[PDB]
Design a protein around this ligand. Sequence first.
Ligand code: PEB
Ligand code: PEB
Ligand code: PEB
Ligand code: PEB
Ligand code: PEB
Ligand code: PEB
Ligand code: PEB
Ligand code: PEB
Ligand code: PEB
Ligand code: PEB
Ligand code: PEB
Ligand code: PEB
Ligand code: PEB
Ligand code: PUB
Lengths: 177, 177, 238, 164, 164, 164, 164
Amino acid sequence: MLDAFSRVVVNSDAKAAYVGGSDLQALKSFIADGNKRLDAVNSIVSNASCMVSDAVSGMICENPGLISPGGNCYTNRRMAACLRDGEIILRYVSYALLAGDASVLEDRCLNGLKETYIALGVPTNSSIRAVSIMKAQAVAFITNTATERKMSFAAGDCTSLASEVASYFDRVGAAIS
Amino acid sequence: MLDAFSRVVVNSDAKAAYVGGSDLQALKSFIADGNKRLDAVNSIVSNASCMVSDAVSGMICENPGLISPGGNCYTNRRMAACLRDGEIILRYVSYALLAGDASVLEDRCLNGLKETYIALGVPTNSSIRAVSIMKAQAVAFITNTATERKMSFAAGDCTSLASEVASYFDRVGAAIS
Amino acid sequence: KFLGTLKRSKDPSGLRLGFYGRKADDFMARSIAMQAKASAAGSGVYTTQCSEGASKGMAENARTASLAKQFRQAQRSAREMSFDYYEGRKYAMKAVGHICNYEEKIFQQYNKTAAAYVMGKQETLLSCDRYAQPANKAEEYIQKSVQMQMKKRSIPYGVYTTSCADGTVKGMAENARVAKESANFRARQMSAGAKAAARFNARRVANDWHNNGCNYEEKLTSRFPAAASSVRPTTNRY
Amino acid sequence: MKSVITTVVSAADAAGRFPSNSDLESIQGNIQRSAARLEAAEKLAGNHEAVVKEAGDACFAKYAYLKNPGEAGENQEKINKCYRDVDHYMRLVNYCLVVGGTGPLDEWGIAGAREVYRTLNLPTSAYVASIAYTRDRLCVPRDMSAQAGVEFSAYLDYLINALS
Amino acid sequence: MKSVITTVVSAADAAGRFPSNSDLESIQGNIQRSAARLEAAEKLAGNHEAVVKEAGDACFAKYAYLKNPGEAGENQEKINKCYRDVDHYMRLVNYCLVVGGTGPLDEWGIAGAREVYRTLNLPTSAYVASIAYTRDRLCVPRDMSAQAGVEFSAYLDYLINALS
Amino acid sequence: MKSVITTVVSAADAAGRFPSNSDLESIQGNIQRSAARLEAAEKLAGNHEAVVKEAGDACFAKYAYLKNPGEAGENQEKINKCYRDVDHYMRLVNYCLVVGGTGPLDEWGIAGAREVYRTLNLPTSAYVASIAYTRDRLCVPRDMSAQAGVEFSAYLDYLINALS
Amino acid sequence: MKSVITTVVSAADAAGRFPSNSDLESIQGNIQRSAARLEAAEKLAGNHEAVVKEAGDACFAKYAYLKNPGEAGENQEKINKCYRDVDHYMRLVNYCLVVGGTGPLDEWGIAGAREVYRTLNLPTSAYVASIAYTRDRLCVPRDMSAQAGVEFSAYLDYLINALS
Ligand SMILES: C=CC1=C(C)[C@@H](Cc2[nH]c(/C=C3N=C(/C=C4/NC(=O)[C@H](C)[C@H]4CC)C(C)=C/3CCC(=O)O)c(CCC(=O)O)c2C)NC1=O
Ligand SMILES: C=CC1=C(C)[C@@H](Cc2[nH]c(/C=C3N=C(/C=C4/NC(=O)[C@H](C)[C@H]4CC)C(C)=C/3CCC(=O)O)c(CCC(=O)O)c2C)NC1=O
Ligand SMILES: C=CC1=C(C)[C@@H](Cc2[nH]c(/C=C3N=C(/C=C4/NC(=O)[C@H](C)[C@H]4CC)C(C)=C/3CCC(=O)O)c(CCC(=O)O)c2C)NC1=O
Ligand SMILES: C=CC1=C(C)[C@@H](Cc2[nH]c(/C=C3N=C(/C=C4\NC(=O)[C@H](C)[C@H]4CC)C(C)=C\3CCC(=O)O)c(CCC(=O)O)c2C)NC1=O
Ligand SMILES: C=CC1=C(C)[C@@H](Cc2[nH]c(/C=C3N=C(/C=C4\NC(=O)[C@H](C)[C@H]4CC)C(C)=C\3CCC(=O)O)c(CCC(=O)O)c2C)NC1=O
Ligand SMILES: C=CC1=C(C)[C@@H](Cc2[nH]c(/C=C3N=C(/C=C4\NC(=O)[C@H](C)[C@H]4CC)C(C)=C\3CCC(=O)O)c(CCC(=O)O)c2C)NC1=O
Ligand SMILES: C=CC1=C(C)[C@@H](Cc2[nH]c(/C=C3N=C(/C=C4\NC(=O)[C@H](C)[C@H]4CC)C(C)=C\3CCC(=O)O)c(CCC(=O)O)c2C)NC1=O
Ligand SMILES: C=CC1=C(C)[C@@H](Cc2[nH]c(/C=C3N=C(/C=C4\NC(=O)[C@H](C)[C@H]4CC)C(C)=C\3CCC(=O)O)c(CCC(=O)O)c2C)NC1=O
Ligand SMILES: C=CC1=C(C)[C@@H](Cc2[nH]c(/C=C3N=C(/C=C4\NC(=O)[C@H](C)[C@H]4CC)C(C)=C\3CCC(=O)O)c(CCC(=O)O)c2C)NC1=O
Ligand SMILES: C=CC1=C(C)[C@@H](Cc2[nH]c(/C=C3N=C(/C=C4\NC(=O)[C@H](C)[C@H]4CC)C(C)=C\3CCC(=O)O)c(CCC(=O)O)c2C)NC1=O
Ligand SMILES: C=CC1=C(C)[C@@H](Cc2[nH]c(/C=C3N=C(/C=C4\NC(=O)[C@H](C)[C@H]4CC)C(C)=C\3CCC(=O)O)c(CCC(=O)O)c2C)NC1=O
Ligand SMILES: C=CC1=C(C)[C@@H](Cc2[nH]c(/C=C3N=C(/C=C4\NC(=O)[C@H](C)[C@H]4CC)C(C)=C\3CCC(=O)O)c(CCC(=O)O)c2C)NC1=O
Ligand SMILES: C=CC1=C(C)[C@@H](Cc2[nH]c(/C=C3N=C(/C=C4\NC(=O)[C@H](C)[C@H]4CC)C(C)=C\3CCC(=O)O)c(CCC(=O)O)c2C)NC1=O
Ligand SMILES: CCC1=C(C)[C@@H](CC2=N/C(=C\c3[nH]c(C[C@@H]4NC(=O)C(C)=C4CC)c(C)c3CCC(=O)O)C(CCC(=O)O)=C2C)NC1=O
């Protein structure tokens, strides 16, 4: 759809700006951090069955009101849609981490998604809790501060993607709020 | 469906075998030839409307039988349906060279292609003549023996691609016959 | 006074079940279509039964075919806007095989979801038009004749309808003719087993939810599946 | 839009699927030849007033019939709009050296070009041949680098190819 | 099948459209990292008899209940078929390092795996955990190159993901 | 084909319906003005060699650029085919004065005219303007009857309209 | 509706196409015989109370069984509604002499006539035979002009044909 190579052209097409080397060097840092950017996205797709079993178990650890029958999320088909909705939001941020841009998150997920949940009856507060576990484990997966799981890497600072992924998950959270 | 990477894994599939250290030195030519293969494929897709306008004009050069009224190919929608059929051999013989294998060519056009042409009254002798024009112009474009078009290249051989592309237009010439 | 709270009635000629419900309704049916685009591409192929163009590029010209269908279904009149709401509700009961507490409890309040299910689930089987190939001259002729009554359904009388208009400009007039003739070839082009699975799939829409009770119309499917595959009883006015 | 981002993040959504390493591989070819692609962009940004004027009456030399009344070039007010028309083609080809593919060309300046021009009695044969003047108008080790002209020249004969 | 050839030459046919430069761009990412992808293939071709035996009783250490009669591993005739079963998974993952995507996995060894195993009373929990033994069983600068393990390891946790 | 027979016997079949008096009425307008329509047909049958030559170099006066090599009119062998090309347009317009509608025009000589000409580098702007020379080239009480030119002239500006 | 306007401006929209001269020809047959069609309309407007009464008991002579209780004509309250019923057929046939085709007949008084009458135990055989009384009830050089009865009589046997 739209990405960081195409973000710098749509403000320049809106001004008919012939693009020269005053804004290329911010993309040249994106050019030079190509392999650093792909270094974070392969630690996040390699444990994606762990995170979908970590978050909504950690969401049912903090609040047992949903597994009570007559609540929201309790029975067997009902929990199948919990892993259904919970996995697909991890698919979209992994698209958004690669583009340098959450534009592909913003159109395929973030249109109208909030009040479909209350036209169903999803509590929006429990979905802020599940996305915050998915925010907190993913920033522990793009670095080496996991409990047992240490992949092999090349060292140095990579906080610049941790500020990128933390600016993506709250964009999910403010969309469903 | 299947590139020249993967001709050597479906026959090892039939023996419960794996691709051990004896069969892939032609593949280690085939990955070391990544940028000589790339320097042939810009030279075809740059002048793609030359080659469909050189083939059908050279076909109506040698044959004024179709231009007669009541023939196969004389009128307006009809010659417009030729430039449908004139490019689609060139369209998939690109991917026969891009993948390296004509298996992407074998199911996607060559299934049922000959029997539709007698069901549409298309004479196959003008079809096999126009594809031999398309072979003769493509081997002068992957090499440096065109008339006026002189693209920039690095020197060396690409007669290994000239034998690959010669084994392609014969394969479509055997399937429309 | 009575703070104008004075409210008479009005004709919306639509769903009118909430502004919040209306903007909800196109999102999940987009997700129903993207569910069903992911069964077409279960294995990661844009599979050859879906065609939406010609030889020459013209899918931006077939954008203007489909956005006309985006527009002509929006400018439907009040009879056909309301008839298609209720016939699609019982057809969504026909579209799902099982009987739920869930699926029709979307599909009878919401109608785009019912409409994107009778289009979406049925396109990733191979009981549609122009995809099942007839064997002989005898099968294609009654395949042709049941299409004539689907002309007679969408053209009920001397007026031609607004909804088989398939074009607006001179460029897309003959583009719509050469679009189907490439797609008619891509039925008999693509495979040998998926088109063999089509003729068993053609009884999977006609026998079970189109001609119940008529054995004659039941063995017409099992003797002629490709003739029973463009019978198109999903009344989409096409 | 049209780029490799429009291929692989859309096909993974069309498969309902993760960004696997098929998708992560496809953008690596941007990185090794963006330096090849983006010294071509400031050439026609540096010549954005230079080669619009040299292409108009090179076209109007071989299309000199337009100056009669009742046609596409009956006054200078047409020619004042005509250097706008080649430059508006020339804006988009500059942008396709930045996005990689032909992104700003097809959804803005290519699709439905064959519903406009001779309806406005504008000759389409002069439109491709003004561009085909500029297609061969290059010199690869002298104007730009040798790695820069093969993105430029492949987009200009595409403009004749996309009008076909 | 499933590759980038299955994306772009099929989507151009699904649009009824030319192989435009969106389709020509998507295969360039094959070329720059096929050398990254295809020294991983001869590792498990070189270890096609080495790591089948080390994965079976690593699975049968943590699944040691099978040896009773009336279950999935009641005799050595089951275990003679069981090293066939992990190797038949192991054949296909080798081939997906060649075609790029997961081409031979989904249409041959993945789809309808959840209609077979416990119907034949075969435990699916041992099937992913035999594979998850081999998923972390790698060492990226020591066994292969560092550019080779990230195609290998992303396919093995996919095998647990595709059974989900 | 395209006539009033193609309207009403096809719409009664498209309704699955009898030839009712809506269909019987539509052909009565053929009868009262076939005498208006069919003294125009023997004019351009009488001038089938007269006005082909007067339209070619009236077009080639205002399109005189063609005679260079590398274009559409580089030799007399093109011009020997070019008087064939205007006459093949001129054959069909004669036949549309007989069938009533534009029957032989659309299915034979109009549809897909915009996929042929500039692909064969033939200028479409000269094609409509050779016809637009002959469009105003009439004199209604002097050449034919006054009831004959309004079928003739409405088909010739249609040829510019159908190329739009 | 149903007229020649419903043919050709709808088929040009169904082709996505201009009103070409196939569409402009079809309405000329309205003009030369609207004078033939529209002295028939004021006959049954002048006899809108005259021939409703002469058709009811001409039908009730050959259908005289209705006057028993438990049937369609058990009281005068049925017969007061019955002269309304033939006149409501008679209103629409007057309007089809104005619109040309059978416009007000099919969408208002014909379609689904075979879902109503014997469900309301009304005999359909008396409905066509009351109309077939009036079908032959004409005298073409004496009541109206000779050019007026052939639109009238072709609509009345159509009413038996449309109930078939
Ligand atoms: C992006 C497109 C673009 C262009 C094409 C140029 C347009 C252009 N090119 C040339 C530069 C030129 N330089 C040469 C010299 C050459 N020596 C050789 O060995 C070759 C045969 C040939 C390469 C073409 C020629 C023939 C011209 C065109 C004629 C001219 O000088 O004006 C000049 C003259 C000034 C100069 O030398 O720079 C101009 C205005 N600018 C642009 O922005
Ligand atoms: C395709 C999959 C595949 C495999 C996994 C291996 C399987 C395997 N790996 C090792 C090689 C090994 N090498 C190490 C050494 C290491 N040093 C470190 O700094 C790291 C922590 C660790 C990387 C794992 C360890 C721990 C093992 C496994 C234990 C063993 O030696 O058998 C050995 C022993 C012989 C050898 O050293 O090669 C075997 C059979 N072969 C295969 O074909
Ligand atoms: C629109 C339908 C319509 C009708 C049918 C009439 C109905 C009608 N027709 C006739 C007129 C009639 N005129 C004739 C004379 C005729 N001389 C011949 O050479 C023929 C055989 C025959 C033509 C039928 C006959 C037989 C009748 C019917 C019997 C009668 O006089 O009532 C009369 C008697 C008064 C009159 O003469 O006008 C009436 C009420 N009015 C209507 O509005
Ligand atoms: C707190 C709120 C907030 C904002 C208001 C923006 C403000 C903002 N926008 C841009 C910069 C930009 N912003 C846009 C986007 C747009 N240009 C348009 O034509 C549209 C109106 C709009 C959405 C499509 C683009 C395309 C650029 C880069 C080029 C340009 O300036 O036009 C920049 C420069 C650095 C950057 O790219 O982030 C900043 C600070 N950012 C924020 O954090
Ligand atoms: C009582 C219920 C209960 C649970 C079910 C777990 C679930 C759980 N895990 C984490 C938090 C986390 N969970 C993981 C995920 C994983 N860690 C691993 O060792 C694996 C590799 C991987 C699962 C496959 C990571 C990396 C963190 C971050 C902190 C940490 O390293 O533990 C959090 C905190 C989230 C936050 O801070 O917002 C919770 C609630 N914890 C609980 O208290
Ligand atoms: C498509 C598959 C693919 C990958 C998985 C990565 C794998 C990867 N990461 C790094 C290399 C690196 N990666 C990081 C980033 C990190 N390192 C850490 O320890 C943290 C876990 C993480 C923070 C997000 C840093 C800081 C370097 C060092 C850069 C260097 O070595 O020059 C390198 C060396 C190349 C370089 O960046 O210069 C490679 C190949 N690249 C790829 O192309
Ligand atoms: C009687 C009418 C007549 C024609 C219309 C042309 C058409 C034509 N061209 C070629 C042959 C060819 N045609 C081309 C194509 C091109 N060459 C260029 O200089 C352009 C760049 C490009 C068109 C855009 C090429 C590259 C060859 C191969 C030999 C050559 O270089 O000329 C052939 C021989 C085919 C064969 O040998 O199989 C024919 C018949 N020749 C004729 O005799
Ligand atoms: C985004 C919107 C959305 C919905 C409204 C539902 C509706 C729905 N269910 C199924 C899919 C299914 N639906 C059922 C139906 C049922 N199972 C039972 O036991 C009940 C009796 C009955 C109603 C609940 C079954 C058994 C399947 C799996 C097999 C099949 O595809 O038919 C599918 C096909 C694709 C898929 O598997 O998701 C869809 C669209 N699912 C969605 O994704
Ligand atoms: C060759 C393919 C073929 C079929 C699959 C069926 C299905 C079918 N039946 C009808 C149309 C009809 N179908 C029936 C059939 C039945 N109504 C009943 O009460 C019985 C249960 C059942 C079998 C006797 C009837 C009575 C009609 C006419 C009324 C209607 O339009 O529904 C139509 C619309 C037009 C048509 O008649 O074709 C179609 C597609 N008919 C076919 O020609
Ligand atoms: C941003 C996208 C964009 C384009 C690709 C071009 C294409 C284009 N040109 C014109 C419109 C025009 N284009 C031309 C140009 C020419 N006529 C000729 O025959 C010569 C070959 C050439 C001059 C060198 C002229 C003269 C008009 C005006 C036509 C008129 O008003 O009659 C129009 C109609 C709207 C308008 O007036 O702008 C469009 C879409 N213009 C654009 O805005
Ligand atoms: C080419 C694709 C392909 C696969 C992916 C596997 C999967 C697979 N395994 C078995 C069949 C089997 N698979 C196993 C294996 C095991 N049982 C366990 O519980 C252990 C975890 C594991 C041994 C390590 C056994 C023991 C059988 C035989 C079951 C039986 O016959 O009862 C079958 C049924 C047909 C057959 O017998 O082959 C299939 C499809 N086999 C294949 O041919
Ligand atoms: C029966 C339907 C019918 C038509 C409507 C015309 C249209 C038409 N003309 C040509 C083909 C041609 N048409 C022309 C004519 C001209 N070129 C110009 O630029 C001048 C304006 C004009 C002369 C006055 C020429 C010169 C060719 C040959 C082109 C070539 O071979 O390069 C062709 C390609 C096949 C052929 O050579 O015939 C077609 C379909 N010819 C037909 O058979
Ligand atoms: C505008 C369109 C229009 C029509 C075409 C007719 C047709 C028609 N007639 C009746 C209804 C009727 N029609 C008749 C008439 C007759 N019964 C007979 O057997 C005799 C042959 C004949 C008298 C001469 C009677 C008696 C009823 C009343 C039936 C009842 O109420 O039981 C109804 C039901 C609604 C109503 O009562 O009006 C309709 C639609 N009426 C219309 O409004
Ligand atoms: C809403 C009206 C509408 C459109 C559609 C597009 C029209 C359109 N479709 C396309 C292309 C197109 N058409 C299809 C077919 C079909 N569609 C799918 O999303 C899947 C999974 C399908 C298979 C059955 C596919 C797969 C593509 C390729 C790109 C894509 O959509 O992912 C392309 C670009 C490809 C090219 O460059 O040639 C365009 C412009 N525009 C519009 O205005």
